[PDB]
Structure formats: structure tokens, C-alpha cells
Amino acid sequence: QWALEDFEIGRPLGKGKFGNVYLAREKQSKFILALKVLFKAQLEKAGVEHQLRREVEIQSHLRHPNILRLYGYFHDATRVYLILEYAPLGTVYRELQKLSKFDEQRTATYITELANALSYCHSKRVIHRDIKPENLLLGSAGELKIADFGWSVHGTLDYLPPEMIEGRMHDEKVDLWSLGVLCYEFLVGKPPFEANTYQETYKRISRVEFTFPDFVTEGARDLISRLLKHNPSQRPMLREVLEHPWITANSS
Amino acid sequence: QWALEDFEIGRPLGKGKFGNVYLAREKQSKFILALKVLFKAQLEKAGVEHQLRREVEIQSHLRHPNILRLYGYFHDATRVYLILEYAPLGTVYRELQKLSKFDEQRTATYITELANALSYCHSKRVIHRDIKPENLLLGSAGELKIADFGWSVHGTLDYLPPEMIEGRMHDEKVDLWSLGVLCYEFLVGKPPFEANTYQETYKRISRVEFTFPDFVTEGARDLISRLLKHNPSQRPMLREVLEHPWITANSS
Ligand SMILES: CC(C)(COP(=O)(O)OP(=O)(O)OC[C@H]1O[C@@H](n2cnc3c(N)ncnc32)[C@H](O)[C@@H]1OP(=O)(O)O)[C@@H](O)C(=O)NCCC(=O)NCCS
Ligand SMILES: CC(C)(COP(=O)(O)OP(=O)(O)OC[C@H]1O[C@@H](n2cnc3c(N)ncnc32)[C@H](O)[C@@H]1OP(=O)(O)O)[C@@H](O)C(=O)NCCC(=O)NCCS
């Protein structure tokens, strides 16, 4: 049974949606890790405590170098504590601010690491949703780590149509749209559908209206255009992304 | 402002999911109507009180001879009262039990009345969901009346795919599957995908596995087969159903 008594609390790593994250050290092993404190008060009033518990159980069994490791968890009267792998190099979003934009090697290596973790979860019947640069942390070796909870595992009837008893929404096909948006932003520095207002961004996502700057090579354009399909079923498989010539030629 | 003081309560018409329905008479007009009493205690604990209020506002503006008229509504400390049009001839489900099965004239006339009410709501940006025989009441002239509440009116974004910002589920295309299931049950006496167990019914809906008894004519088979498409976008429009040769030849 884990307890707050087992950890030495250090500097705060930052503040999240429902609490704070601290650098910590397990007292017996002297092992450095991150302790994410989530207040049940604002978790229950946001209506996400049930959603969170499901996402924590799924992540507790995921072991992949490109997925932030959840070692364990515990709780008290008002808080829930998550024992997490500490990522020392920060977020990809901030690294993209430091470098303005990534080159083709770093971009293809990031896509390779993302596609490996997603294909690992695909084999483990785990599906991931939308992926942001802010939810991507970097380990000590420069490898990225998916660091969010967006994981999922998946009489009257006589009158229901198939679109209400089947499936249905949504399969492991949104992560492929995310690979297209991320790969674009990594190479360019901006998301492909960013606009001056809300409805203009909404329209350009609905019609898939994006263009490439003149410094984006044909291999990157080919990968981004195949990932960014309005039809989810026509987006590649995760194996095709890992075997794409631009990826196999530029990935580390 | 309506109040329970304005009505004389008579015999109970039946018991619903969240209350009871009574025959009533407005004291000033001596007008016979039905008073549906819904207990807020079991409405709030079932998590449907918010859903119900939205469905009641939509129905309060629907005026169609084949839609059960909602005259008004009021509430007190623990109950919500719905002033409804009284249907004297009961449900189509019970009439189907009395007649075992309907002929082609009654079936086509029922489909015509259902399609008119749905096309009326389609023009009023109102969409209806699954339709059961138990939710279809009969007026004094033998016309059916839809008598349920299944009515509806319809920064991070940079990383969301179109299948999450668009639409999406589900359009006014489930009512067309309902017309196929109802038209079949009216002519046959049983829903087309009824089976001995749950998963067998689930499978035959998923694969659209249904057959016609030898007494079902080709015109009815043509209408049912076009309504019962696994692809919603390939189901007819409500105007095609009203113009179908089997409908136009048998409807009253
Ligand atoms: C998105 C947001 C609400 C937080 O959401 P969240 O899902 O709760 O994020 P988390 O709780 O998982 O992590 C919060 C912090 O702890 C850090 N962290 C979490 N786990 C970590 C770990 N194992 N190792 C190292 N750092 C970690 C994160 O990097 C983050 O730091 P940051 O805020 O400096 O980037 C917050 O980032 C925000 O509002 N930022 C400002 C908005 C803005 O200015 N621009 C973006 C438009 S929305
Ligand atoms: C579906 C069920 C739970 C009720 O759900 P509901 O949406 O709350 O139904 P309602 O509150 O709108 O109406 C309830 C009664 O009032 C009647 N009623 C409602 N409004 C009326 C009106 N304006 N005029 C006349 N009668 C009316 C209905 O006909 C119904 O009568 P019934 O139960 O004898 O058929 C209930 O019908 C049931 O459980 N039946 C038994 C199940 C069964 O044996 N077979 C079906 C498999 S589920």
C-alpha cells in the first residue's frame, strides 16, 4: 500500500488542470520520480473523477519507453496521488518554442516514437485520442513520452438501427490525424489549420484546407497528406507510417 | 400559469417509466385531456430531468395531427405535470395484438401518417429517434399519434480530427430504419430481427439479416428492403417513402 509517508517532496514541476505536479523521491529506494496530486474536490465537481479512474487503471498496465510510466497510485481524504515517471527535458511544445521548428530527422524520429507507442497500444486493445504537443514529455535520452490519460480499451433492441447498437465512435483512427497534425507542426512550427478565429479553423478542418511552406520536402508532404484524410478509413495503418520512405530515410 | 387546481382528475390511463397518466378535464372549458404526472424524485435520480425538460420544450411547439399534442406543463414541489392530448383508442402495439397483424391498407396508411409527421419535423429542424409501436397512440379517427419525447433540434481545436468537431451522430436517418422495422412488424406481426436471444438479434441487425413470409407482396418487400439499409445515407428520403408505389396504391 502506497502512502505519502514514502516520498520526499521537492520542487513543483508545474500546475495541471486539477492539481499540481512535484518532483519527489521514494524514501527507501532514493528513486527520483514525479508525484502528481489531483484534488478530488475539483475532480468530482468537474465530473471527471469517474473518467480519471478508468484512465488510470488502463495506464497502470502500459509499459513502453515512449509512454510515461505510471508506477502506482494512492489517495487520502481529499486528494489522489499518481506516482509517475519523471521526465527531465520538459515538453515537446516548449522545445518547439526553443527551436522554432524541428528538422526532418527530429520530426521523423518523434513520429517513429509516437507510432511505436500507438501500435503497441493497438496490439493491447488500447486506443489513444487527440494528441497535443503539450502532452508530450521528453526523457533523459531525448525520447518523447505520451504523458496524458487519453487511453481507452475497446428487448428494445428490435427497433434500433445498426448505427446505434454497433461500435461506433471512434476507432484508433484519430491518432493518425494527430500524427499528421503533429508532423506538420514539428516541421513548420504551426498547426496546419490554425486561423485568426474559431470558425475559420473549424472550416479548414472540416474541408481539410491546408498548404505547405516552400521548405517542406515532397516526402514529408506525402506523409502529411496521407495522414490528413477527412475519411478516417483511408488514413494509413500505423505500420505504413513506420515504413513510409520519408520516415525510414530520416528517422534516427 | 397552469395549476393542478384547474383540472378534474379521472381514471388512470396507465403507468409510465417515471409516473402515471390520468384522464382529466379542464374545469373551465370542460375539455377532456390526459394529465401525465412525472415525479421529479425518480426523474432526477435517473439522470433524465435535464433531458426531459429539453424534450418537453421541443414538443410544446410541435402541432401535427399525427403527433400527440402537448398543450402545456407545470410543476410543484416533487412532480412535473404534462397537459397532453388524450388518445382514446390506445396504442398501435395493443391493436397489433388484437388484430395479430395488419393488412396492406392499414399498414400503408400508418406509414403515410408516420412519414408526414417526420417530414413535418424535418422541415422544422426537429429530428426523431427510435420509434416503437408502444409509443404510437391512436386518436378518435383512427389516426396514429407519435407519443414519446424522442425529439431533438439540430484553442485545442487545432488538434481535433473532423469526426470530432463535425456533426455528427445521428442525423434524421434512424427514423427511416424505424419505418422499415414498423412496416415489417405491421404486415408480419413480429419485428424483422427478433431472435431467441440477445446476441442473435444483435447479429441480425448488424448484418441486416431478415426474410419475408410468403404472404408479403413485392411492393411491400421493395419498400422494406430500401428502408432497411445498413448504410444510413442510402435509405430513401421521406418524400420517396410517401411517393413509393406500394404506399400510393394502398394508403387510405
Ligand atoms: C493544459 C493545462 C490546463 C494543464 O492540463 P493537464 O492535463 O492537467 O497537465 P498536467 O497536470 O498533466 O501537467 C502539468 C505540468 O506538470 C508537468 N509534468 C507532468 N508530469 C510530469 C512528469 N512526469 N515529469 C515532468 N513534468 C511533468 C507538465 O510538463 C506540466 O508542466 P507545464 O504546465 O509547465 O507545461 C495547462 O497546460 C495550461 O493551461 N497552460 C496554459 C494555456 C496556454 O497558455 N497555452 C495553451 C492553450 S490551451
Ligand atoms: C415502456 C414502459 C416502461 C413505459 O414507458 P413510458 O415512456 O414512461 O410510457 P408513458 O408514460 O408515456 O405512458 C404510459 C401509459 O400511459 C398511456 N398514455 C400516455 N399518454 C396517453 C394519452 N395522451 N392518451 C391515452 N393514453 C396515454 C400510454 O398508452 C401507456 O399505457 P400502457 O402502459 O397501458 O401501454 C411500459 O410500457 C412497460 O414497462 N410495459 C411492460 C413491458 C412489457 O411487458 N413488454 C414490452 C418490453 S419493454
The single-letter DSSP state of residue B193 is T
Cell representation of residue B59: 414538443
Q: How many CB atoms lie within 10 A of CB B49?
A: 16
**Chains A–B, number of C-beta pairs less than 8 Å apart:** 91
CA-based diameter of chain A, in Å? Answer: 61
CA distance A172 to A190: 24
In this structure, are strands A32-39 and A79-84 parallel, antiparallel, or unpaired? antiparallel
The kind and range of the H/E element at B170 are: none
The kind and range of the H/E element at B83 are: strand B79-84
B147 lines ligand 2 (CB under 6 A): yes
CA distance A27 to A9: 10
**Residues contacting A148, CB < 8 A, separation 6+:** A131, A132, A135
* Peptide-bond breaks in chain B following residues (C–N over 2.5 A): 154
Is the separation of the CB atoms in A202 and B239 below 8 Å?
no
A21 lines ligand 1 (CB under 6 A): yes
The single-letter DSSP state of residue B91 is B
The single-letter DSSP state of residue A236 is P
The CATH number covering residue B164 comes to: 1.10.510.10
Helical segments of chain B, H only: 40-45, 49-59, 92-99, 104-123, 162-165, 174-188, 198-206, 218-227, 238-242, 245-250
CA distance B88 to B139: 6
Is the separation of the CB atoms in A142 and A100 below 8 Å?
no
Q: Which of A76, A103, A130, A171 is catalytic?
A: A130
Cell representation of residue B175: 427514423
Residue A136 sits at φ, ψ, to 5 deg, of -115, 110
Buried b (16+ CB within 10 A) or exposed e, B16-36: eebbebbbbbbeeeeeebbbb
Q: How many CB atoms lie within 10 A of CB B180?
A: 24
Q: How many CB atoms lie within 10 A of CB A219?
A: 17
Resolution in angstrom units: 2.7
CA distance B171 to B228: 16
Residue A232 with chain B: CB contacts under 8 Å = 161, 163
Q: How far is A73 from chain B (nearest CA, A)?
A: 28
Is the separation of the CB atoms in A133 and A187 below 8 Å?
no
The boundaries of the domain holding residue B235 are 90-251
Q: Which of residues 189-208 of A touch B (CB under 8 A)?
A: 191, 193-194, 198, 201-202, 205-206, 208
Provide the residue type at B4 as one letter: L
Contact A206 B132 (CB under 8 A): no
Cis omega before residue B122 (within 30°)?
Answer: no
Residue A132 with chain B: CB contacts under 8 Å = 156, 159
What is the CB-side half-sphere exposure of residue B95 using CA atoms within 13 A? 22
CA distance A118 to B227: 39
Angle between helices B174-188 and B218-227 (to 10 degrees): 150
Is the separation of the CB atoms in B238 and B227 below 8 Å?
no
Hey, which residues does B158 pair with through a beta bridge?
A: none
Which ligand number lies closest to the CA of residue A24?
Answer: 1
B17 is in an annotated binding site: yes
**Residues contacting A105, CB < 8 A, separation 6+:** A250, A251, A252
Report the catalytic residues of B. Answer: 130
Contact A165 B202 (CB under 8 A): yes
E-assigned strands of A27-168? 32-39, 70-75, 79-84, 126-128, 136-138, 144-146, 151-153
In this structure, are strands A126-128 and A151-153 parallel, antiparallel, or unpaired? antiparallel
Sign of CA dihedral A120, A125, A130, A134: negative
- What three-state secondary structure class fits A185? helix
Cis omega before residue A125 (within 30°)?
Answer: no
CA distance A148 to B221: 52
Contact A158 B193 (CB under 8 A): yes
Q: Distance from first CA to last CA of chain A, Å, rounded?
A: 41
Cell representation of residue B95: 391493436
A16 lines ligand 1 (CB under 6 A): yes
CA distance B145 to B149: 12
- Examine the residue annotation and report whether A130 is marked as an active-site residue of this protein: yes
Question: What distance in angstroms lies between residue B43's CA and the mean position of ligand 1's atoms?
Answer: 39
- What three-state secondary structure class fits A98? helix
Interface contact A150, partner B, CB < 8 A: no
* Ramachandran category for residue A238: left, alpha or beta (phi over 0 → left; psi -120 to 50 → alpha): alpha
Provide the residue type at A192 as one letter: P
CA distance A206 to B165: 8
Provide the residue type at A73 as one letter: Y
Cell representation of residue A19: 492539481
CA angle B234-B238-B241, nearest 5°? 85
**Residue of chain B whose alpha carbon sits nearest to that of A134:** B156
Contact B232 A161 (CB under 8 A): yes
Is the separation of the CB atoms in A226 and A235 below 8 Å?
yes
Cell representation of residue B173: 436517418
Pocket test for ligand 2, best of B18, B21, B85 (most atoms within 8 A of CB): B21
